[PDB]
Amino acid sequence: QAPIAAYKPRSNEILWDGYGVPHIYGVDAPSAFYGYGWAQARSHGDNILRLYGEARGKGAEYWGPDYEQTTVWLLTNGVPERAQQWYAQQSPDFRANLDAFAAGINAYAQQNPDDISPEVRQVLPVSGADVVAHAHRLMNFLYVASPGRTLGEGDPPDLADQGANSWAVAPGKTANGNALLLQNPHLSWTTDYFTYYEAHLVTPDFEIYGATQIGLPVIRFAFNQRMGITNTVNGMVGATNYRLTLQDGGYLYDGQVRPFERRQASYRLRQADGSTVDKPLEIRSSVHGPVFERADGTAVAVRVAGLDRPGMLEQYFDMITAHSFDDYEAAMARMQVPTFNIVYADREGTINYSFNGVAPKRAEGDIAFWQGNVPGDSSRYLWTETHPLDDLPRVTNPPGGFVQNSNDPPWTPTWPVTYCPANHPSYLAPQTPHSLRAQQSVRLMSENDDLTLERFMALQFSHRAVMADRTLPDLIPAALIDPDPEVQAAARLLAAWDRDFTSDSRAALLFEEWARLFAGQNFAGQAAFATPWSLDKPVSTPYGVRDPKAAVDQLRTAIANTKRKYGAIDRPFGDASRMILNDVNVPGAAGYGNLGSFRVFTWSDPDENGIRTPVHGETWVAMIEFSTPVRAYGLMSYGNSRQPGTTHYSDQIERVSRADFRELLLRREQVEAAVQERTPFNF
């Protein structure tokens, strides 16, 4: 019936468990945020202070050369100053929480100066504005508008490997009648701002368990006794790069030569000897927005949407603390979160999918057109309005009894679908072939019924080489008629494979190498299938091999590659695939999502000895059943801390190698039973 009574904290304290997971208890909100800020300082202080410093545009001043590009990017886009505005524009209530958070961080550093790396001490003290600045940078100028896209360069490995999985199951599809939720982000294992942190906040008025990126005062992947939500990247096109026609010191626009908006700014660049050199920086703007110059000499102006949405953090906070789905939807309706697909589920039995973000209203052009260089010489392409929530693809309690997204276009959020590409403007999302992992996603959910939490988790462990199922039947035969015995031996090895990425697979590695050539290095190539992908058979296409003879030459080559990389065509998958953190070295399993593996581990290239580890992949994984009280399990691949000397960095990877999940503790008693360290505090 009613949720179990939440705990009313009678004093401020952090109860840490054996895994470095803080259970922050505050007599009020500001107190809790302060504890949260303290805990994050404890667990990831160095990187948070580094990121906050960058967000001030002081990256070059504080750490020199390797941080300069980001400084120029953030200054030119006026990020540090807008953070001050956004900060000021906060609601009095929330601004107090942000100030607490910053005080928590400051406090921790004050009482533990030794735990703070020397090179980041100059960043202290930090303020509520700094928090806001970072989140603004992350959301708007990393996720939505990255310097790579605008500068016409690219980005260090983050192509399609910035993915995730997400499921929400309606009570009707379960055995117990409680909704189920899956949080499963697949971001880099090394990039600092992408590091996830696990925490638990409790005040007399709210409770929030979950993971979030270091430096964020709100929990993005949260849940509690009442509800929970998860996120996945949808690539919402919130920015436009306009090509400019330079002319007579200005730029051509609507037939006339408009002069630029010029501002002479400056920043400090640290020198090897510790001194700083003052460096000039002219910031030019066009009616579109800031202007950058590419290497090829192209003058590009970037127009980022939602620069007037200062309530990002508060939206997330109100969303996750919502007392009902209605409240939740009202919160999301503020349009303060610029991107992401978001999934919801609660103890009431409601599940929801939302292609969220702030999208510019446009009158022409498909997504591909808007993702490229839009002509910047006419007011014809200068958008100003953005779409309301109800203009975007969304699903609630569908007939299928579930929702899901694995970075695939929003065209198959459930089965049967409830809408189609035609119902929305063609610039919102792409209409491209869904990845094999995404197809596996729809299958695992729609094909199963009467689910239990345990079965639900087991399905999450799927590591099927769907790619094989679509190709081997045609490849194998064609390869067997090849005169080269080694090729024939390869075909037999492959045909004996159960087509699952297990540690012991002797054919997996070889298959991958073949697939690299058959479907491109990222495994997304379609040019080689006999039957092209189709939205009408979204989970069974593409299929077959268009040119078996060619594909065999590819296998011929792939065989050489496998031996060169691993030393044999039949090396055990988990012998070359390892998960190495600190001094822990465990065998790997599961693999590339584009090859159909639901559970993901994007293996890196192998080293001298054919050993390789995950570059991106599983990180924070949790499955929640909204029973009363709720039940949840989770694991954090890379622990809950990265502070030099911490015992909580490599202390979970072993359980990951065995899919041995931790029961997430929400109830006071459970917490008291697992406490290993108490940190009392006053705000």
UniProtKB/Swiss-Prot annotation:
One of its GO terms (cellular component) is periplasmic space. InterPro entries: Ntn_hydrolases_N (IPR029055), Pen/GL7ACA/AHL_acylase (IPR014395), Penicillin_amidase_A-knob (IPR043147), Penicillin_amidase_dom1 (IPR023343), Penicillin_amidase_N_B-knob (IPR043146), S45 (IPR002692). It holds the Pfam family Penicil_amidase. It is found in: Periplasm. Its EC number is 3.5.1.93. It comes from the Bacteria. Residues 153-163 form a propeptide. The active site is at 164 (nucleophile), 186, 618. SUPFAM superfamilies: N-terminal nucleophile aminohydrolases (Ntn hydrolases) (SSF56235). The keyword Hydrolase applies. The keyword Ion transport does not apply. It catalyses: (7R)-7-(4-carboxybutanamido)cephalosporanate + H2O = (7R)-7-aminocephalosporanate + glutarate. Its main location: periplasm. GO terms for molecular function: glutaryl-7-aminocephalosporanic-acid acylase activity. Keywords: Antibiotic resistance, Hydrolase, Periplasm, Signal, Zymogen. One of its GO terms (biological process) is response to antibiotic. Catalyzes the deacylation of 7 beta-(4-carboxybutanamido)cephalosporanic acid (glutaryl-7-aminocephalosporanic acid or GL-7-ACA) to 7-aminocephalosporanic acid (7-ACA). Cannot efficiently use cephalosporin C (CPC), penicillin G, or ampicillin as substrates. Heterodimer of a small subunit and a large subunit processed from the same precursor. Belongs to the peptidase S45 family. This is Glutaryl-7-aminocephalosporanic-acid acylase.
